[PDB]
Amino acid sequence: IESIIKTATDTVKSEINAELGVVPSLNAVETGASSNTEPEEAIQTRTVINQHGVSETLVENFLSRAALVSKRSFEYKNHTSSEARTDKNFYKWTINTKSFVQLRRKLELFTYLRFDAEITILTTVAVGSNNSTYMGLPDLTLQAMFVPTGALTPEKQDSFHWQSGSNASVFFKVSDPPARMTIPFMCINSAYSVFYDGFAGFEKNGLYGINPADTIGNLCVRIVNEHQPIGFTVTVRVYMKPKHIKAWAPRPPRTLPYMSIANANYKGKERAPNALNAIIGNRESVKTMPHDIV
Amino acid sequence: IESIIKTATDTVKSEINAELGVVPSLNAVETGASSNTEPEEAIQTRTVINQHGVSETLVENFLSRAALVSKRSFEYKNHTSSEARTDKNFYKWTINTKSFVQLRRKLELFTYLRFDAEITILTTVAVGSNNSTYMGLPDLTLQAMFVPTGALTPEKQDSFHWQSGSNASVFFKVSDPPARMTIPFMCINSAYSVFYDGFAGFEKNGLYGINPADTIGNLCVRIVNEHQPIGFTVTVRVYMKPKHIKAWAPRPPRTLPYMSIANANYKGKERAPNALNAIIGNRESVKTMPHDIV
Amino acid sequence: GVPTYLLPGSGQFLTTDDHSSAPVLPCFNPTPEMHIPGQVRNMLEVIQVESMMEINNTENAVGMQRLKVDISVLTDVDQLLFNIPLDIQLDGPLRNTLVGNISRYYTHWSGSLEMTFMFCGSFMATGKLILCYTPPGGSCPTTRETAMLGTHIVWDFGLQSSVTLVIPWISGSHYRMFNNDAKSTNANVGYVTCFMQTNLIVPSESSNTCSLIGFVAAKDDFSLRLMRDSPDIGQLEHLHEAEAAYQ
């Protein structure tokens, strides 16, 4: 407790400490992690002043890396002519922390996470394969509107829900710096429960793990410009940088590959490593050293 | 009165308050809203310190959201060749608070509103469907000139009223950040009367609700560049962010769908919710719970 | 100063941004403020004012009959007079209020909800109403003995002719979400079930079908975050005198 240490702690000089009645290396794992330090036993250490880095491995600095949370490549054409389910020059994305396994595993080291989401939207335009000719990349103004969870989301590109009188929207060009915005810590609880051992509704048919409090919202991203005669694959990549991190109850890292966004269902690879019956790639025996120096 | 409260007010601990001769929960609705608080009666509350958010639900913060007020998609071609009524590479828009129902309903919660209008113009270029080929999006410089209400508005793209010697105009490119300007609070009265129970002129044939004092002006938006051989649908989206809000006489929110920009005429949907005879979607009975937990 | 690198959030149009923008008239003095009455500087000033709940909410009730609930002389005790779902952010009897419609401009809300019921019967119409807000987790109580276990208040009409059932703020989270599902733990609020306590007794020359107007307001402990567009209004088509404000 009350440690405001800014570097790695230095070790002191250790002599021969063969004292009867006390032994530091003998501990109890059945209490917690052991307190046997380096100059206490098992090594006759020297006094080395430790000036090593700690600010980089801060939980803030651990989780303040802008990693991808929504890579959606939607076509930009006459979608109103003949499309059924595909994204009609717009997509409503439920803002989840779980779409990409890197930042999902990074935030899933902790049970609770209070952070503001620095959402940076990097949108790229490519020409779709139907046109098969470049003809220039157009400067496209895009609207990303943060709709609250469960509120009324637009259904069209010109759906008249894009006025953003009360909803917060950001207009940004593709020939511009990427859209940097800060979604607040908007959870109704005092942290985002990255895991939820419970159900959303008071009925028994609710979904497991989907607390709507920790659901951030819905980024509805559209092209503000009307349709071009040429279709364009607009690949919008929302990277979320979690900032002002306050973390609680650290957890085992996710070892098996993720299967679903909604839950923590597990199925390992068909052989080790990261398999269901064997997280680590198997050695020949207990007495066999892999990558032994020869 | 004299409350400069910055958070939600905390409740105090409440014991059994069965006192004869006084009863807090018994009030008079025939005076106003009741003053029976939580620790007074009907609950034995605990002292919970309330640190909840108030700055987000400030009337300033409620109405300082840049919502759409003028989405006009006008063609950019040889309009002078053969067009009759359509917008000849320019449009004069009477700046009204009432074009889009989101920000219209937001400002129509209050009778009076003193604000400066942060007009942000996000203009998008799309290729019109007659050309049916991309060929690049051109960088178009647009002039938005704020003409006073009733003053001389231009009639052409090169109408010689675009000199803006006295009128205030903003020149802005489509390959640029959107045009951020602040129209002042320019009403001849000390607030914008969002509703007007009166007529504009001293004659009896005036229009009801159109006070020219609360009419902000006329944004005449044109392409400064001369016509291209390719026509372009220029969709200019004026979003108005009302800033320095001072609000007066709060009102019922508009429940029925809006019919006209000019007046507050009403016609609900063909069945509830938001219908003329039933604003709320109907239940089965008074004793029937919709979405009851089962 | 001179060395300036553009941020990733530069050149974008945020809706909720607060940066100072350019004037159009370089020396415009506005008309000075007069003291217009009722200066509104926060939504809580509008929030704590009572507003009629649409308690009846039934297809035979047309207009005026929806804002009141007709409570009648019952021949037997322990019937549900009415039950009100307290989804202030979802479509219900609390939607068409100040607190419901204004809180639907937000996704997250908190605070106690005062609910004042005014008995609009005759003076000689006597009766006790028991109004029980039930915390979420179970079904809506259709019987009084399951209802009085929650936050219940017993109200004799008398001379004051109105009561305030203050719905307290009991929730696991600090706020309650909108989330478009009324079954959720962070969205379901409870059920205000009003029952007969000692039956409504009227004279024969007074109307047996008495009427009750309920209201929901809040207290100063109310709070709102995560502003969103309200689904009460909606534009599927450009209204009249639009494209005539352009011509």
Add this chain to the structure above:
Amino acid sequence: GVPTYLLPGSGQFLTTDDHSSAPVLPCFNPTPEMHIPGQVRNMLEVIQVESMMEINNTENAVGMQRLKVDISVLTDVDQLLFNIPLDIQLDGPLRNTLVGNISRYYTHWSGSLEMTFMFCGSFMATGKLILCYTPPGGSCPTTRETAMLGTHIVWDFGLQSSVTLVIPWISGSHYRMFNNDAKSTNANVGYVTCFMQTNLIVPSESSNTCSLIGFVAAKDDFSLRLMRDSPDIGQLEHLHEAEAAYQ
């Protein structure tokens, strides 16, 4: 001020950049902090906690048998019980730990690694284990007399039933790289080779195949730089309920 020239690093999107960006709600007050237990402000708070090493690491060991090593009553002295490669950033028995998985979010690491072995046998099961971390430069010691020249500890089970072999920080550089090669000078760490010292003696009514659970944590001298994406997880395909969080 007014004269501003754009830097070469202007308009770019750095992942690790820390510039303040725009709010979306202009007056959003978040819900206030409650004292949730276990506030984690640095990775070293998670780093120095013990976590099971996958010592067995063998194909016959399925699941539960991998996190323990079955030490048996040997008929002869001076056999290797097990040897653990200490590549905390490479796939091995130290990979599936707090320190291994969290240090694989970094390329450079430093500090002493505590390794606590808890004897999960019977009370009457007696035996001395000699655990020898060997500094890199040579082969893994398969014999005890080549192993005790390094950092060796002798452990009698007794009442405490657990020992901590603290692997010291002896390296030429200040940090050790990941570098994807376990043979390298700046990546190979040493070998923790555990041997019988005075053999494991159990009674006939106790289990001869006793079991040992080892753990690696670190001390407060641990440190991590050059954050990278961990190879423990990997996305070759968009998971389930993605494209259903969009629909």
Add this chain to the structure above:
Amino acid sequence: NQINFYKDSYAASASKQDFSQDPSKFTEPVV
């Protein structure tokens, strides 16, 4: 926190600091 470099007071940032509120105008407009 204000970058109002223009000469007009109406051109400033949206002043979300008017925390003074009087609900007794609308809640209790009596006596």
Add this chain to the structure above:
Amino acid sequence: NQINFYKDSYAASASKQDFSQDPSKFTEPVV
């Protein structure tokens, strides 16, 4: 080193200065 010019405290720079840490919550959660 902070260019937080916006009116919200949540919009500030990523505060990589919380050097206070207590490993005894998780290492030694005893007595």
Add this chain to the structure above:
Amino acid sequence: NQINFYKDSYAASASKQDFSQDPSKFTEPVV
């Protein structure tokens, strides 16, 4: 409120602060 970073006084902002006025030059040019 002035971001005049150039070395010429004529390059400054439009000085809309010359509130001194004398209408008696043109209204009452007598005695």
Add this chain to the structure above:
Amino acid sequence: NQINFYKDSYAASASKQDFSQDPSKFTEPVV
């Protein structure tokens, strides 16, 4: 009025302030 943020003195603004002049070098180069 100088926004010289670079570390070299030669990179500064054009110093149009050297008002000292001596015409008697060239007008009267006598005695």
Add this chain to the structure above:
Amino acid sequence: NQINFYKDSYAASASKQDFSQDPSKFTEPVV
């Protein structure tokens, strides 16, 4: 003359001010 607005000391300007030099390390490495 330094516009180091980032939170890392390694991100600063190229410090061309280390004028201290010791040539006797390499010129006269004797006695």
